[PDB]
Amino acid sequence: TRFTEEYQLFEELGKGSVVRRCVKVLAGQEYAAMIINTKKLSARDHQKLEREARICRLLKHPNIVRLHDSISEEGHHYLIFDLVTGGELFEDIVAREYYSEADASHCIQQILEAVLHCHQMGVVHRNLKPENLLLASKLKGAAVKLADFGLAIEVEGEQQAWFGFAGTPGYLSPEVLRKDPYGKPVDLWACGVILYILLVGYPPFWDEDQHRLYQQIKAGAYDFPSPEWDTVTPEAKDLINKMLTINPSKRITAAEALKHPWISHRSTVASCMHRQETVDCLKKFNARRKLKG
Amino acid sequence: VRKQEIIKVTEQLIEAISNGDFESYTKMCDPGMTAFEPEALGNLVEGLDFHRFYFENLWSKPVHTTILNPHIHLMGDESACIAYIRITQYLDAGGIPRTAQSEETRVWHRRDGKWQIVHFHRSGAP
Amino acid sequence: VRKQEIIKVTEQLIEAISNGDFESYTKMCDPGMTAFEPEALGNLVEGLDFHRFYFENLPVHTTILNPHIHLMGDESACIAYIRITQYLDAGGIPRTAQSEETRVWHRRDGKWQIVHFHRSGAP
Amino acid sequence: VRKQEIIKVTEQLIEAISNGDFESYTKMCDPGMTAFEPEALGNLVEGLDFHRFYFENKPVHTTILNPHIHLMGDESACIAYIRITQYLDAGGIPRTAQSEETRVWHRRDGKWQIVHFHRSGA
Amino acid sequence: VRKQEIIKVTEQLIEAISNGDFESYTKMCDPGMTAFEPEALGNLVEGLDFHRFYFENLPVHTTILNPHIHLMGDESACIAYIRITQYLDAGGIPRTAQSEETRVWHRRDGKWQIVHFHRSGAP
Amino acid sequence: VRKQEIIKVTEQLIEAISNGDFESYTKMCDPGMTAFEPEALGNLVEGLDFHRFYFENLWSRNSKPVHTTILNPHIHLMGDESACIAYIRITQYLDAGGIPRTAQSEETRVWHRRDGKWQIVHFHRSGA
Amino acid sequence: VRKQEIIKVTEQLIEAISNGDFESYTKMCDPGMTAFEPEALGNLVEGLDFHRFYFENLWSRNSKPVHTTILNPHIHLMGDESACIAYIRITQYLDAGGIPRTAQSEETRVWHRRDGKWQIVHFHRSGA
Amino acid sequence: VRKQEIIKVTEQLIEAISNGDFESYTKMCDPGMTAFEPEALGNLVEGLDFHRFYFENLPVHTTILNPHIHLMGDESACIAYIRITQYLDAGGIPRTAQSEETRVWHRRDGKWQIVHFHRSGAP
Amino acid sequence: VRKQEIIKVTEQLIEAISNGDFESYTKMCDPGMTAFEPEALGNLVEGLDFHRFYFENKPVHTTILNPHIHLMGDESACIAYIRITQYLDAGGIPRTAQSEETRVWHRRDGKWQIVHFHRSGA
Amino acid sequence: VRKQEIIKVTEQLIEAISNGDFESYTKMCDPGMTAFEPEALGNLVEGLDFHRFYFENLWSSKPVHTTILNPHIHLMGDESACIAYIRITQYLDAGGIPRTAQSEETRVWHRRDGKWQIVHFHRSGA
Amino acid sequence: VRKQEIIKVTEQLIEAISNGDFESYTKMCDPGMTAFEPEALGNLVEGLDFHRFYFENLWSKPVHTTILNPHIHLMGDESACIAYIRITQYLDAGGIPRTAQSEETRVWHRRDGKWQIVHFHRSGAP
Amino acid sequence: VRKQEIIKVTEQLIEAISNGDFESYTKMCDPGMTAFEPEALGNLVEGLDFHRFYFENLPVHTTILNPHIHLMGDESACIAYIRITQYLDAGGIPRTAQSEETRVWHRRDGKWQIVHFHRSGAP
Amino acid sequence: VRKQEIIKVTEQLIEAISNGDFESYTKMCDPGMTAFEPEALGNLVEGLDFHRFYFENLWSSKPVHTTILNPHIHLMGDESACIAYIRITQYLDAGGIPRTAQSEETRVWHRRDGKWQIVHFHRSGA
């Protein structure tokens, strides 16, 4: 009703509902509008609407898209968070001509920054993955921004519970595959599977039989296959072992992962050798997951 | 050539059920889909809300699915029907290898260039 | 309006089965008609040769509950329903049986015909 | 006082069933009467076309136990009771069956009629 | 007019059962409510004293099929439906159970209350 | 003496049942008599019409031999006008075919004297 | 009044059984009390030692919730010092697992007042 | 010495049963004879009143296996044996049934009489 | 009077069985004692070697019903009775079992002894 | 062409069994024919004496309809072949009451002196 | 050659049982013969008086007997033992063809130049 | 005197089975020994290869009832008996089992050996 | 000699199945192998994908002893053969408790390019 008058609509950004760029007429500014058709899934959907909209009203981080309002029209609903044109991150990185341990530490830092914020806000993302990681602009020094969805949740303090089975098979923690209560930690485990791809450009776990992929993910079976991992600082490999910890209670918190700087200090102290092969594999994986996923 | 497409979308459907991928399952199903199945206790259930329960709770034990003697009836360029026998080799609580048969009928309808199930009928053991 | 056409040819079908009229039943069925039914013992039978045995060899009241119809163009439809059957055994007592039925109709040369059907429950 | 009227139309109903009088039964039932019963195999049957078959088809004895009547205003009531039936099975041995019956009466055009009834057991 | 009005208090009943809130269930039931149910073992049990044991001692999904509402004036209604419940047994195996439910609602002082309940035939 | 009286009227009751004599059985039973028995399917029947069915159809037709045995009778006297007998009733009979069969039924008979005559106000049977 | 008295002592009996209180149950039962119940396997047990086993082992251990319902009580008064109650006993309980179960038992209690106090001289149970 | 003397009255007992002669059976049994048998349904029945029903209402072949005799002085004996009976059922089909029998004999006034009988577990 | 002696040696017998005292049981049984029992699977077992196995192998309650004693002279008797046993089955639910027992006592060397016993049921 | 030849002799076999013609059944079977069938109770039967009891008694006759489903033929040289299929029989028991029965059958054919003969056959669930 | 004699007398025995010829049966059996058989209910019976009942009462319906896999142990020139599987095709009350298996052991002893059964053991269905 | 020899070698056999001594069992059996037993599922097994599985892979009290012996010369015998077995299941309860056994012994080079044996009942 | 050759490849087959060696099992089987077995629930299975589930899961291992009874071989030319036999398996279930199972098996061998391969096999009661 109200989004009809104040706003003007322009090109689509993405689809799933449809994302589209708009600009507010009254105080001229761009945003990005989720157009959620009035056909969602009766109830299970409407519940996730208000959850996503609430969470995003709460999440205001410099590294996370912030919402503005959520308007309900007749045959549609609109959610207006912050706009971007940056391309995907795993897409920008391949375009880079110099990729080093120090660019990867610059990423996981901003990442852990969005994560920590919300973990302090009693909310867990549960779906952490390349898709969900984007670049503010293509402009230099553009920021990584976490994409708030939608299998998301509000925990009580540090209390662990069973929030049900959600997320992507590769990005799923064992505590969730074991069908045990969980919490903020299931987010840290994702980052760890993310960092590992953020170095060598292939994932730590995978199998075509998904029953098997899950077994690895429940068994913590990953290793640092030579040569590609030989040129990698043992600090890098250290963080990776701290996130990729099977027991969530022993798992490095997000607060802890920022202080230990194989990122901040290896930004200061780590390997910059441009690894062109990793970058290539990376790009390939990306295309595959786009078509396969 | 026209039947190979139905084979493709059907195998994708059975893969989504086997891997417990409910989102891909919802994409290949019409929102107003009807189903006769042994889990419905002789009742006709409408929508996907009834199958979600099986996707969440029931679905990492090794399971193998076999498709025997498919038959495809083409009814234009937008509607097709496929009927087949589905065998499932699995492991029970005791780890013993087991096998189950199931007769299945899938009614596909092409909407917006995308085949979707409008109705399906399963019989035999669940 | 079109749903009542499928319902009409379906009622004509059920009555053609109840009277034992294999002629009209053959006219309403495609020659390559496939069938799942308890009489086939989990197998898929093709043609009308399997159903002839019943018209030839075989006080009944049939009831249809909650018919749903899926139209897929102007030449394809699919109807699903519950079929209750009240009959008498040789013992003479009234018995009731339930069977869930699915019929797949296809218009060919301006006439609906069954291409495939799937029944569960009462054998 | 108005309980023996529900009992009266209920006794005329049961007697109409025992005599196989479809003519009176139709008068006592609304045309759009719904029914749950074992003969329906868990399905909800509407109308009287389903109950007709059971009128075309020796000594039996019926006993009604613990009748409870709920009065809802002056044009609607509901009676629930246990029905025991003693009969003979072909070989002639005496048998007995239990049923849990619920009748829902409504007064339209100055006449009580069953709008829906629910049965459990035999 | 009041069919949705009946569905409202029916849904509130379902919510009172799901949350285990026995007080709300007491507000929506007549003090002399009678109930036939499989847990009664064929006996006619009166009052909420029998259901109490379940509100003080109790992952599922419920589906309502073929709801029929009978409006009997401005103070009486009766709803009947089929309830299918999907649950996980002690084996952790998916199981499903069917019930046929009949609720008899009476209006007193501007509120709907259950005066009789009849379920069959699964607990 | 009173024990013998209660056994006498009890054996007269069982004798009226074995012969299908509904008149004598009616005279020995209170009009408001209640009953628990397997034929009642776990219900408490009141009166005599429920047993009348079995007197008219089953027990009136009996021309085959039937022999009843009362094992271990126990009598509780509760004043001058009340008594209670419990016993094991074993019935030797011939089935549909000519094969001898035996049935056991635990029986409790509650006797109350009104108008100078003992009458059953309640009985309870188990087994078939 | 007397009907209420018999229902009172009956509910006190069932209350003593539900709590496993063998002392109160002993006080409400005659020493020469006889019994028919499924636990006796068609036999007539006499005394209280047969029920003592269930008081000591089964009913003393119960910490789980148990709710008893007395359906359709019928009372026969037989003089000032005797009465007889019959009812349907429905028990809601929790089994070995945490699953609610229901049991039905037809019960006949024969009450006799001695020393100004009602006591059971005989009872009869059916069903399990 | 008396083992054959016990076998004699045992054989006379078998003959009294085979001929249906209830008088001879009465002469060979104590008036207060007790009996456990499957027809007693686990109850201890006293006297010949129970066996009477069988002597007034009754192609077979009987075999006695492993007879054991216990002589207990000059006035008491006890014989135990396995009895196998071959008969023709209502189907006209050959059937066989096993029983384990124990007879307790007492001497009074120069004659052996059954004071207790125990059979298991086929009629 | 001489019935409570049969009852006495019978109670010492049952108590010897419940305590698992093979030593006393052997004294109470003749060496050539014969037995019919369900554990024998319809066969006649002689001696005590067969009963030994059942002494090597918690709270149970035994009730003896309708004991009948036949006295045969002054050196032989026979007691028959019904034995009810309440126990607990692994899961701990109370159970009850019925048995029909017949003991045959004989006095040799001034001591009652079982020469043969017959059991039905459990 | 050869596959069809096997189909020919097989159809003649089924017709010979249905007609109760033991004469024609003998010609199409080797004198030392091997047999596994439920009528042999898990035993291996040699010869034609065993099936003669069924040719003489039962088949010598209410309406019966046979249906062959999913036939597969393996050709093993010029002189050897093997066919496997599902046999479904519709019949009537006592006062029909139409009934149906399934069996899984394997026939092993061998051409001896210019004539196909069964050397061994296997049946299940009949 | 020595085993063929045992085959002969054994086939004569089974022929006597099949034809219900009890006199020929008594000639081929020792008077003190012992037998374990399902009709004896796990008991050991001695003599021929126990089998006479089956010869008279039970034994004109067509019945066919098949002897599968005989094994003969020769123990001198006067004692032999044969063990075999016996199949029986018969007709029940409904006229339906039926079949029954039975494992049989026969212990032959040559007395006065004539083989006689001293003991036999049958198992399976009677 | 000779019967006790068969009984002796038979008791040595049963004890050789109870202890799991396949060596002495092999010495007491002919290499071409044939066997009928419930473990063979109605088939006839030859040699000792079938019985090795039990000595290798497999509180017991054995009792022998009514042994009968048939002597057929000075080099051949056959013993038949009832074998009762009192044991304990994994549940711990004492169980009893019956099996009728037939052993065929043949003296070869001055030593009795089993040529064939037939057991029925307990598997 | 040729009969013995069939026995050789058959024993190697049984040993390959027992050891859970799917590699050797693949060589001795035709890629389009036909199969009737109780694990297929009355259906005809083609290929080796179906038995792979049993090679991967179950057989990859407590003491098990196999016994072949009454083998019969039909030679049908130089390049074709068929063997039928009774397989008895002794094993242990959970906490044995030694168990035994019977099955009736038919193998159809065909020499292709100087190597015997199974083209079809049939199993009963397993």
From Swiss-Prot, chains J, M:
Calcium/calmodulin-dependent protein kinase that functions autonomously after Ca(2+)/calmodulin-binding and autophosphorylation, and is involved in various processes, such as synaptic plasticity, neurotransmitter release and long-term potentiation. Member of the NMDAR signaling complex in excitatory synapses, it regulates NMDAR-dependent potentiation of the AMPAR and therefore excitatory synaptic transmission. Regulates dendritic spine development. Also regulates the migration of developing neurons. Phosphorylates the transcription factor FOXO3 to activate its transcriptional activity. The modification Phosphoserine is found at S60. Belongs to the protein kinase superfamily. CAMK Ser/Thr protein kinase family. CaMK subfamily. The chain holds residues 345 to 472 of 478 of the full protein. Changing H120Y: In MRT63; decreased oligomerization. It is linked to Intellectual developmental disorder, autosomal dominant 53: A disorder characterized by significantly below average general intellectual functioning associated with impairments in adaptive behavior and manifested during the developmental period. Intellectual developmental disorder, autosomal recessive 63: A disorder characterized by significantly below average general intellectual functioning associated with impairments in adaptive behavior and manifested during the developmental period. MRT63 patients manifest global developmental delay, severe intellectual disability, and seizures. It comes from Homo sapiens (Human). It is found in: Synapse; Postsynaptic density; Cell projection, Dendritic spine; Cell projection, Dendrite. Coiled coil: none annotated. There are 4 genes encoding calcium/calmodulin-dependent protein kinase type II chains: CAMK2A, CAMK2B, CAMK2G and CAMK2D. The corresponding proteins assemble into homo- or heteromultimeric holoenzymes composed of 12 subunits with two hexameric rings stacked one on top of the other. Interacts with BAALC. Interacts with MPDZ. Interacts with SYN1. Interacts with CAMK2N2. Interacts with SYNGAP1. Interacts with SYNPO2. Interacts with SHANK3. Interacts with GRIN2B. Interacts with CACNB2. Interacts with LRRC7. Interacts with GRM5. Palmitoylated. Probably palmitoylated by ZDHHC3 and ZDHHC7. This is Calcium/calmodulin-dependent protein kinase type II subunit alpha.
